[PDB]
Motif scaffolding. Sequence first.
Motif, PDB file in Angstrom:
ATOM      1  N   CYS A 119      19.856  -8.705   5.491  1.00  0.00           N
ATOM      2  CA  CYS A 119      19.909  -9.925   4.992  1.00  0.00           C
ATOM      3  C   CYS A 119      20.984 -10.661   4.822  1.00  0.00           C
ATOM      4  O   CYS A 119      22.092 -10.264   4.497  1.00  0.00           O
ATOM      5  N   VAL A 120      21.027 -11.973   4.984  1.00  0.00           N
ATOM      6  CA  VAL A 120      22.226 -12.980   5.028  1.00  0.00           C
ATOM      7  C   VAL A 120      21.809 -14.126   4.400  1.00  0.00           C
ATOM      8  O   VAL A 120      20.947 -14.868   4.438  1.00  0.00           O
ATOM      9  N   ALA A 121      22.877 -14.653   3.368  1.00  0.00           N
ATOM     10  CA  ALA A 121      22.811 -16.108   2.882  1.00  0.00           C
ATOM     11  C   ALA A 121      24.326 -16.772   3.126  1.00  0.00           C
ATOM     12  O   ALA A 121      25.397 -15.984   3.025  1.00  0.00           O
ATOM     13  N   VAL A 122      24.120 -17.957   3.351  1.00  0.00           N
ATOM     14  CA  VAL A 122      25.315 -18.752   3.849  1.00  0.00           C
ATOM     15  C   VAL A 122      25.103 -20.069   2.803  1.00  0.00           C
ATOM     16  O   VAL A 122      24.093 -20.772   3.049  1.00  0.00           O
ATOM     17  N   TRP A 123      26.144 -20.275   2.010  1.00  0.00           N
ATOM     18  CA  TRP A 123      26.096 -21.673   1.297  1.00  0.00           C
ATOM     19  C   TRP A 123      27.030 -22.374   1.568  1.00  0.00           C
ATOM     20  O   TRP A 123      28.469 -22.026   1.792  1.00  0.00           O
ATOM     21  N   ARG A 124      27.214 -23.579   1.802  1.00  0.00           N
ATOM     22  CA  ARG A 124      28.103 -24.673   2.398  1.00  0.00           C
ATOM     23  C   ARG A 124      27.833 -25.870   1.717  1.00  0.00           C
ATOM     24  O   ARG A 124      26.618 -26.575   1.858  1.00  0.00           O
ATOM     25  N   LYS A 125      28.884 -26.618   1.567  1.00  0.00           N
ATOM     26  CA  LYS A 125      29.262 -27.681   0.845  1.00  0.00           C
ATOM     27  C   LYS A 125      30.086 -28.553   1.925  1.00  0.00           C
ATOM     28  O   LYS A 125      31.263 -28.366   1.815  1.00  0.00           O
ATOM     29  N   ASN A 126      29.535 -29.546   2.477  1.00  0.00           N
ATOM     30  CA  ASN A 126      30.365 -30.666   3.131  1.00  0.00           C
ATOM     31  C   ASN A 126      30.421 -31.936   2.519  1.00  0.00           C
ATOM     32  O   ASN A 126      29.880 -32.037   1.231  1.00  0.00           O
ATOM     33  N   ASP A 127      31.034 -33.029   3.280  1.00  0.00           N
ATOM     34  CA  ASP A 127      30.852 -34.218   2.348  1.00  0.00           C
ATOM     35  C   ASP A 127      29.624 -35.129   2.458  1.00  0.00           C
ATOM     36  O   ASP A 127      29.740 -35.886   1.638  1.00  0.00           O
ATOM     37  N   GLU A 128      28.630 -34.492   2.899  1.00  0.00           N
ATOM     38  CA  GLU A 128      27.338 -35.055   2.937  1.00  0.00           C
ATOM     39  C   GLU A 128      26.515 -34.240   2.053  1.00  0.00           C
ATOM     40  O   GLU A 128      25.308 -34.898   1.674  1.00  0.00           O
ATOM     41  N   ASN A 129      26.353 -32.901   2.091  1.00  0.00           N
ATOM     42  CA  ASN A 129      25.183 -32.141   1.239  1.00  0.00           C
ATOM     43  C   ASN A 129      25.627 -30.911   1.043  1.00  0.00           C
ATOM     44  O   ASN A 129      26.707 -30.282   1.436  1.00  0.00           O
ATOM     45  N   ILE A 130      24.867 -29.811   0.358  1.00  0.00           N
ATOM     46  CA  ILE A 130      24.859 -28.810   0.222  1.00  0.00           C
ATOM     47  C   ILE A 130      23.841 -28.016   0.736  1.00  0.00           C
ATOM     48  O   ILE A 130      22.581 -28.381   0.622  1.00  0.00           O
ATOM     49  N   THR A 131      23.908 -26.921   1.538  1.00  0.00           N
ATOM     50  CA  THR A 131      23.011 -26.220   2.179  1.00  0.00           C
ATOM     51  C   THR A 131      23.008 -24.797   1.881  1.00  0.00           C
ATOM     52  O   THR A 131      24.128 -24.124   1.657  1.00  0.00           O
ATOM     53  N   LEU A 132      21.702 -23.888   2.007  1.00  0.00           N
ATOM     54  CA  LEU A 132      21.835 -22.625   1.760  1.00  0.00           C
ATOM     55  C   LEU A 132      20.772 -22.006   3.093  1.00  0.00           C
ATOM     56  O   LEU A 132      19.703 -22.712   3.008  1.00  0.00           O
ATOM     57  N   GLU A 133      21.427 -21.291   3.670  1.00  0.00           N
ATOM     58  CA  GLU A 133      20.854 -20.701   4.836  1.00  0.00           C
ATOM     59  C   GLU A 133      20.538 -19.238   4.519  1.00  0.00           C
ATOM     60  O   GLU A 133      21.440 -18.516   4.240  1.00  0.00           O
ATOM     61  N   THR A 134      19.265 -18.908   4.684  1.00  0.00           N
ATOM     62  CA  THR A 134      18.636 -17.375   4.717  1.00  0.00           C
ATOM     63  C   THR A 134      18.158 -16.780   6.053  1.00  0.00           C
ATOM     64  O   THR A 134      17.354 -17.475   6.601  1.00  0.00           O
ATOM     65  N   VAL A 135      18.669 -15.863   6.445  1.00  0.00           N
ATOM     66  CA  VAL A 135      18.205 -15.415   7.718  1.00  0.00           C
ATOM     67  C   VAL A 135      18.133 -13.690   7.646  1.00  0.00           C
ATOM     68  O   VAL A 135      18.897 -13.302   6.648  1.00  0.00           O
ATOM     69  N   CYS A 136      17.678 -13.133   8.637  1.00  0.00           N
ATOM     70  CA  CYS A 136      17.686 -11.761   9.108  1.00  0.00           C
ATOM     71  C   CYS A 136      18.849 -11.818  10.130  1.00  0.00           C
ATOM     72  O   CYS A 136      18.882 -12.588  11.030  1.00  0.00           O
ATOM     73  N   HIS A 137      19.925 -10.875  10.180  1.00  0.00           N
ATOM     74  CA  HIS A 137      20.669 -10.931  11.283  1.00  0.00           C
ATOM     75  C   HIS A 137      21.325  -9.523  11.489  1.00  0.00           C
ATOM     76  O   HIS A 137      21.509  -8.504  10.458  1.00  0.00           O
ATOM     77  N   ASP A 138      21.428  -8.965  12.763  1.00  0.00           N
ATOM     78  CA  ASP A 138      22.220  -7.872  13.190  1.00  0.00           C
ATOM     79  C   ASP A 138      23.799  -7.667  12.625  1.00  0.00           C
ATOM     80  O   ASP A 138      24.553  -8.548  13.301  1.00  0.00           O
ATOM     81  N   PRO A 139      23.893  -6.680  11.915  1.00  0.00           N
ATOM     82  CA  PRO A 139      25.433  -7.092  11.417  1.00  0.00           C
ATOM     83  C   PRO A 139      26.650  -6.519  12.240  1.00  0.00           C
ATOM     84  O   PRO A 139      27.516  -6.445  11.717  1.00  0.00           O
ATOM     85  N   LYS A 140      26.233  -5.759  13.481  1.00  0.00           N
ATOM     86  CA  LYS A 140      27.208  -5.755  14.338  1.00  0.00           C
ATOM     87  C   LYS A 140      27.317  -6.952  15.149  1.00  0.00           C
ATOM     88  O   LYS A 140      28.158  -6.907  16.273  1.00  0.00           O
ATOM     89  N   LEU A 141      26.672  -7.979  15.107  1.00  0.00           N
ATOM     90  CA  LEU A 141      26.884  -9.128  15.541  1.00  0.00           C
ATOM     91  C   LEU A 141      27.688 -10.289  14.656  1.00  0.00           C
ATOM     92  O   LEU A 141      27.425 -10.257  13.573  1.00  0.00           O
ATOM     93  N   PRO A 142      28.656 -11.139  15.066  1.00  0.00           N
ATOM     94  CA  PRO A 142      28.981 -12.031  14.100  1.00  0.00           C
ATOM     95  C   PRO A 142      28.023 -13.012  13.712  1.00  0.00           C
ATOM     96  O   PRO A 142      27.256 -13.329  14.403  1.00  0.00           O
ATOM     97  N   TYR A 143      28.137 -13.878  12.473  1.00  0.00           N
ATOM     98  CA  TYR A 143      27.315 -15.055  12.281  1.00  0.00           C
ATOM     99  C   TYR A 143      28.447 -15.863  11.760  1.00  0.00           C
ATOM    100  O   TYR A 143      29.388 -15.616  10.943  1.00  0.00           O
ATOM    101  N   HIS A 144      28.222 -17.213  12.402  1.00  0.00           N
ATOM    102  CA  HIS A 144      29.205 -18.138  12.100  1.00  0.00           C
ATOM    103  C   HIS A 144      30.783 -17.780  12.397  1.00  0.00           C
ATOM    104  O   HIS A 144      31.422 -18.165  11.580  1.00  0.00           O
ATOM    105  N   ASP A 145      30.805 -17.036  13.223  1.00  0.00           N
ATOM    106  CA  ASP A 145      32.171 -16.474  13.719  1.00  0.00           C
ATOM    107  C   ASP A 145      32.810 -15.499  12.723  1.00  0.00           C
ATOM    108  O   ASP A 145      34.065 -15.330  12.836  1.00  0.00           O
ATOM    109  N   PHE A 146      32.193 -14.803  11.939  1.00  0.00           N
ATOM    110  CA  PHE A 146      32.684 -14.035  10.851  1.00  0.00           C
ATOM    111  C   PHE A 146      32.035 -12.553  11.257  1.00  0.00           C
ATOM    112  O   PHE A 146      30.560 -12.500  11.494  1.00  0.00           O
ATOM    113  N   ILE A 147      32.629 -11.547  10.405  1.00  0.00           N
ATOM    114  CA  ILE A 147      31.987 -10.277  10.707  1.00  0.00           C
ATOM    115  C   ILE A 147      31.363 -10.023   9.151  1.00  0.00           C
ATOM    116  O   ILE A 147      32.104 -10.066   8.097  1.00  0.00           O
TER     117      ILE A 147
END
Length: 107
Positions: free
Chosen positions: A41-69
């Motif tokens: 399981c993965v969650a990503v919380w991001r706040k930019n100049d326009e909004n706040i988002t929370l992303e929830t996904v399943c993901h293979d942890p030997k692959l990067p996500y958003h360019d992070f390990i």
Amino acid sequence: AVKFPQLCKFCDVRFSTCDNQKSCMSNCSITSICEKPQEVCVAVWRKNDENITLETVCHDPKLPYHDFILEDAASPKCIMKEKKKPGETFFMCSCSSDECNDNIIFS
């Protein structure tokens, strides 16, 4: 014998009301059976100049996500860890217990 798939919140990107809190619920109604048994399981919380988002996904942890390990995949809990990313505030966790990306913990 066999590793069964994780259950994870899997709403992809959602707008979030989660801000200025030590922890947050995902408010994602989609508990998914991950397609592949090595996914976590993965969650990503991001706040930019326009909004706040929370992303929830399943993901293979030997692959990067958003360019992070995903170094925290063995954790049973989703402990958000900050990453630096141009022009936004970005936090991410991964975890390997069922629906663990439903409870997002900042501290």
